[PDB]
Amino acid sequence: GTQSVQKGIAITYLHVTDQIMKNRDVIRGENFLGNGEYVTFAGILEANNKIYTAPIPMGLSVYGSAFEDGKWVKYPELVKTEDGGSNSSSYEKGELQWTQYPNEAWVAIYNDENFNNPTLIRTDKISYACGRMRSQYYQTIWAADNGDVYVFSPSYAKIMDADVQKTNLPAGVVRIKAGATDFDSYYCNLEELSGGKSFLRCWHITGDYFLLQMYTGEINSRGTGATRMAVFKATGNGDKGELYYVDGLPEPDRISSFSGTPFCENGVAYVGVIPITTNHPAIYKIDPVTHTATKGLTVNATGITAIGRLAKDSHSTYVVSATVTSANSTANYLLATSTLESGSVTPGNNNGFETATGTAWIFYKDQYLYRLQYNGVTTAYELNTNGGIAKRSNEYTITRFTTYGIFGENIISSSAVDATFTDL
Ligand SMILES: [Cl-]
């Protein structure tokens, strides 16, 4: 056969029990959806004993636009004539950047973590299901407690330069019932409910309630103005969806950012709120039933990069990962606390453990906290038998990732990559 550089999908596993890293053979990304384009997985969602992801279309690679004399090139006027761009937006001559098919969304359903033989399904009711901010892809596919998978799209593609690459669909939601292999008839237009606004990203809270980080103005590539929260009850209003803005958070013009991953327990969501700059980050409790927020634990640091729990034998604690950023340096501290609802935490005591910053953080149940970092090594933490934060024995070298999640006993990370493939 003929080997060439093509777009692939990388999959990396961190097995939390064995403490072993494995690299899956690279998956072909070219023509993943049958239109020549390659994809970036957004989300590794465990539900119904299966993995759901949104394969986000990327446009055409250099290989894909040249393939069989431009078979896949629908809009040749968009193929780049020379190298250019900057950062994640950088492109090579011959690429077609961004999808040519913005008015649809796909979901891949995999039977297990081997990522073989996906069930690929398409809807024309929403655009693609992820959020975006510069180089980041945010998961927007989530399961209700009953296993129903809700597939949200903020319609990020509305901000594309070329008309044919804009979506004309409003931000909205569709559904895959638990155990089903295709979408049902559910559809909710979120812009009609929100006052014309989309969202940066979203998460599950409990039951059929989801948390949306809402925009105050237009969606944009820098995340500007993503300073409100709303609670979406998917089956509310007679299975039409119901959206309520959250009351009790700081005023939007006082919010610098929210932390990236809420912590959900006891039916509520705990969210890190970073105010504009004495004004410290604090963790707010959001009750989805009343769409009300209350101020809890104050964090005496720059930011909040993880909230969760660690447990070992008869010891357990909450763990807040906090950043300390100076003019000349970045630091991260893991801070133990018995409560998220009052008081404060401050680096500088025995209940704190310093780490390098990490690209992303994820808790595996209440057993481990993983600090995912590419080059830099990936590390993991636990409670020791004495109840203190401890580093696990094994470290890992992983590559750049754009999505991550847990299935079974594996932490899984993924990215679109260049790789050699053999064609017939
Ligand atoms: Cl439910």
SS (H, E, C) the chain: CEEEEEEEEEEEEEECCCCEEEECCCEECCCCCCCCCCEEEEEEEEECCEEEEEEEECEECHHHHHCCCCCCCCCHHHCCCCCECCHHHCECCCCEECCCCCCCEEEEEECCCCCCCCEEEEECCCCCCEEEECCEEEECEEECCCCCEEEEECCHHHHCCCHHHCCCCCCEEEEECCCCCCCCCCCEEHHHHHCCCCEEEEEEEECCEEEEEECCCCCCCCCCCCCEEEEEECCHHHHCCEEEECECCCCHHHEEEECCCCEEECCEEEEEEEECCCCCCEEEEEECCCCEEEEEEEECCCEEEEEEEEEECCEEEEEEEEEEECCCCEEEEEEEECCCCCCEECCCCCCEEEECCCCEEEEECCCEEEEECECCCEEEEEECCCCCEEECCCCECECCCCEEEEECCEEEEEEEEEEEEEEC
64 C-alpha to center of ligand 1: Å? 41
208 C-alpha to center of ligand 1: Å? 5
Resolution in units of Å: 1.6
Q: How far apart are CA 364 and CA 407, in angstroms?
A: 10
Q: How far apart are CA 364 and CA 405, in angstroms?
A: 10
235 C-alpha to center of ligand 1: Å? 9
Breaks in the chain (C to N over 2.5 Å), named by the residue before each, are: 277, 375
Q: And the tokens for 253?
A: 């013009």
62 C-alpha to center of ligand 1: Å? 44
Q: How far apart are CA 386 and CA 384, in angstroms?
A: 5
**Residue located via tokens 């044919």:** 164
Beta-strand relationship, 209-214 and 141-143: unpaired
The answer to whether 69 touches 76, Cβ cutoff 8 Å, is no
Which candidate, 72, 64, 97, 70, places its Cα nearest to that of 82? 97
* φ, ψ dihedrals at 239, nearest 5°: 70, 30
> End-to-end distance of the chain based on CA atoms, in angstroms?
5
- Beta-carbon contacts of 241 under 8 Å, excluding residues fewer than 6 positions away, are 173, 188, 190, 193, 232, 233, 234, 235
Ion ligand 1 neighbours, Cβ < 5 Å: 144-146, 207-208
207 C-alpha to center of ligand 1: Å? 4
Q: How far apart are CA 379 and CA 369, in angstroms?
A: 9
* Total Cβ atoms within 10 A of residue 285: 18
* Total Cβ atoms within 10 A of residue 327: 4
147 C-alpha to center of ligand 1: Å? 7
The answer to whether 305 touches 332, Cβ cutoff 8 Å, is yes
* Total Cβ atoms within 10 A of residue 109: 20
Alpha-carbon separation of residue 351 from 154, 271, 305, 360, 388 (angstroms)? 40, 21, 17, 22, 7
Q: How far apart are CA 294 and CA 341, in angstroms?
A: 9
Class of residue 266 by CB neighbours under 10 A (exposed 0-12, middle 13-18, buried 19+): exposed
Q: How far from chain centre, in Å, is Cα 1?
A: 37
Beta-strand relationship, 410-423 and 2-15: antiparallel
Q: How far apart are CA 189 and CA 169, in angstroms?
A: 9
Q: How far apart are CA 78 and CA 17, in angstroms?
A: 48
R_g (Cα) of the chain, nearest Å: 22
193 C-alpha to center of ligand 1: Å? 21
257 C-alpha to center of ligand 1: Å? 29
Per this entry, what is the length of the chain?
424
53 C-alpha to center of ligand 1: Å? 20
- Beta-carbon contacts of 13 under 8 Å, excluding residues fewer than 6 positions away, are 21, 22, 23, 24, 113, 410, 411, 412
141 C-alpha to center of ligand 1: Å? 15
127 C-alpha to center of ligand 1: Å? 25
* Partners of 405 in the β-ladder: 412
CB crowding 162-183: b at 16 or more within 10 Å, else e: eeebbbebbbbbbbbbeeeeeb
Beta-strand relationship, 344-345 and 292-299: parallel
289 C-alpha to center of ligand 1: Å? 14
* Partners of 41 in the β-ladder: 55
The answer to whether 211 touches 263, Cβ cutoff 8 Å, is no
**Largest Cα–Cα separation, the chain:** 66
Q: How far apart are CA 211 and CA 139, in angstroms?
A: 12
- The answer on whether 354 is annotated among ligand-binding residues is yes
32 C-alpha to center of ligand 1: Å? 31
- Beta-carbon contacts of 238 under 8 Å, excluding residues fewer than 6 positions away, are none
Q: How far from chain centre, in Å, is Cα 54?
A: 11
146 C-alpha to center of ligand 1: Å? 4
